[PDB]
Amino acid sequence: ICVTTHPAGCEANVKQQIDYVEAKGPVVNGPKKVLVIGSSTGYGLAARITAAFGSGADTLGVFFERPGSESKPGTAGWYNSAAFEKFAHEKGLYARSINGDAFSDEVKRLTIETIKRDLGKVDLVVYSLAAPRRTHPKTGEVFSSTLKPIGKSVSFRGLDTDKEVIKDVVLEAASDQEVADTVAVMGGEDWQMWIDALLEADVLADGAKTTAFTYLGEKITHDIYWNGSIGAAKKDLDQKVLGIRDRLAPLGGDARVSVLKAVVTQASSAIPMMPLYLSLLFKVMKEQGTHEGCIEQVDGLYRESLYGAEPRLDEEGRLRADYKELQPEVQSRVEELWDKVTNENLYELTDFAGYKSEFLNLFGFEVAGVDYEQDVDPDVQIANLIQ
């Protein structure tokens, strides 16, 4: 499926996230100069909005988005970032962006150069890259990530989102090479490179923090995710953060892996089993009153753990914001309903309507307060953007 991009709806999407953060009040003792790698959509965009509008932080964002021209709309992340900087410049904040491949050495060189000239040093480094592939910045070798289980193939009842049909599917296992590629793409090496390079150039302030986002889920998803190929990459993140945290010790800084809840993004809608899992989870958590989106998760992570008094930790040293999803009352009902979902009860036993709505929100469609019978103007420019 292709969904075009609605510029006006994307801006209203950014404004609504800004409104949520501002209503919750300032982030006490928060960061003032934040670098967000992957700052145009999803959790990274939420992190940039929480920093700028919760803490009054200057933000430098790195993303990879297609710009807009006459009669050809760019990607949603382009209009998201364009709207973010427009709102941020209003409040008096510094907001600049870099459009390029964050895995490359040149973007790191440009980011360091921009920080020196524009900010000096940064308070916090948010690492939220979601890429299906990575080109190694030293051997040009391209790695492509895979979402398969390890060991045994898995059967389950999926959901054809186009035909709106429950399908019997089978996911084959992953070879040792597919897992190695997935670790190269989604592991911690590039995050490790980022902090190293930022340390040599001395653009990390005293007590600087860095965090990378991850997902653990519960038992229903462990075969595909956590104990699959993608989980081996996130498992590599937990090994890398121990090294990162050490290099930040002479500064008095910290490095943490932050676990967030499952959310409809462009990167998770592709994962197997996710459309049906999200449709069920949305219904169970809505009737329970714990349904949360991107901005609620990251705003809470800033306030309670990243810069709070009593951080929500686990026994591995990770900051946690996903606890409501993993609760037995939520998980056990999702597991019970999964089998009883057929083509006829789709909208009655699941929140497939909510999943579809939130998926179209990513592109600027079905956003409250937007007039969708007006001509779309796709030529939106971003002042002082660096390519």
Distance, in Å, from the CA atom of 25 to the CA atom of 287, rounded to the nearest integer, reads 27
Query: Is 373 annotated for ligand binding?
Result: no
Q: Is 208 annotated as a binding residue?
A: no
Nearer to ligand NAI (CB atom), residue 205 or residue 261: 261
Query: Which of 87/213 has CB closer to ligand NAI?
Result: 213
Of 133, 64, 124, 132, residue with least CA distance to 298: 124
Give the chain's count of helices (H) and strands (E).
13, 11
Of 147 and 205, CB closest to ligand NAI? 147
Q: Compute the least distance from the CB of residue 373 to ligand NAI, in Å.
A: 28
Distance in Å, CB of 76 to ligand NAI, minimum: 9
CB 228 within 8 Å of CB 179 = no
DSSP string covering 227-255: TBHHHHHHHHHHHHHHHHHHHTTTTT-EE
Active site residue 225: yes
Q: Minimal distance in Å, beta carbon 250 to ligand NAI?
A: 28
**CB of 261 within 8 A of CB of 297?**
yes
Task: Tell me if residue 97 falls in helix, strand or coil.
Answer: strand
Q: C-alpha angle 67/73/77, rounded to 5°?
A: 55
Chain residues in the site for ligand NAI (CB under 6 A): 38-44, 62-65, 77, 101-103, 128-131, 213-215, 260, 262-263, 265-268
- The letter for the amino acid at 255 is A
43 is known to lie in a ligand binding site: yes
Instruction: Select 251 or 266, whichever has its Cβ closest to ligand NAI.
Output: 266
- DSSP category for residue 375: P
The annotation status of 39 as a binding-site residue, yes or no, is yes
DSSP state, 184?
A: H
- Concatenated DSSP letters of 4-65: ---HHHHHHHHHHHHHHHHHH---TT--SEEEEES-SSHHHHHHHHHHHHHH--EEEEEE--
Separation CA 256–CA 277 (nearest Å) = 27
Give the residue closest to ligand NAI by C-beta. Answer: 42
Q: Give the span between the Cα atoms of 186 and 181, in whole angstroms.
A: 9
- Nearest distance, CB of residue 228 and ligand NAI, angstroms: 13
Q: What separation, in Å, do the N-terminal and C-terminal C-alpha atoms of the chain show? A: 29
- 15 labelled as ligand-binding? no
Q: Please tell me whether 215 is known to bind a ligand.
A: yes
| Residue number with CB closer to ligand NAI (102 or 195) | 102
- Least Å distance, CB 206 to ligand NAI, is 27
Strand pairing report for 254-259 and 142-144 = unpaired
Q: How far is the CB of 214 from ligand NAI (least distance, A)?
A: 6
Tell whether residue 302 is among the known ligand binding residues.
Answer: no
Q: 225, 277, 307, 355: which one is catalytic?
A: 225
Q: Is residue 111 a contact partner of residue 34, using CB atoms and an 8 Å limit?
A: no
Alpha helices by DSSP H, listed for 201-344, are 219-222, 229-247, 274-288, 294-301, 328-339
Contact of 79 with 11, CB cutoff 8 Å = yes
User: Whole-number minimum distance, CB 191 to ligand NAI, in Å?
Assistant: 10
- Return the C-alpha torsion angle 226, 231, 234, 236, nearest 10: 120
Of 143 and 215, which CB lies nearer to ligand NAI in the complex structure?
215
Nearest to ligand NAI of 43, 363 (CB atom): 43
64 appears as a binding residue in the annotation: yes
Query: Known binder of ligand: residue 38?
Result: yes
Annotated binding site: which residue ranges? 38-43, 64-65, 101-102, 129-130, 215, 234, 263-265
Annotated binding site for substrate: which residue ranges? 215
Catalytically active residues, by annotation = 225
Annotated binding site for NAD(+): which residue ranges? 38-43, 64-65, 101-102, 129-130, 234, 263-265
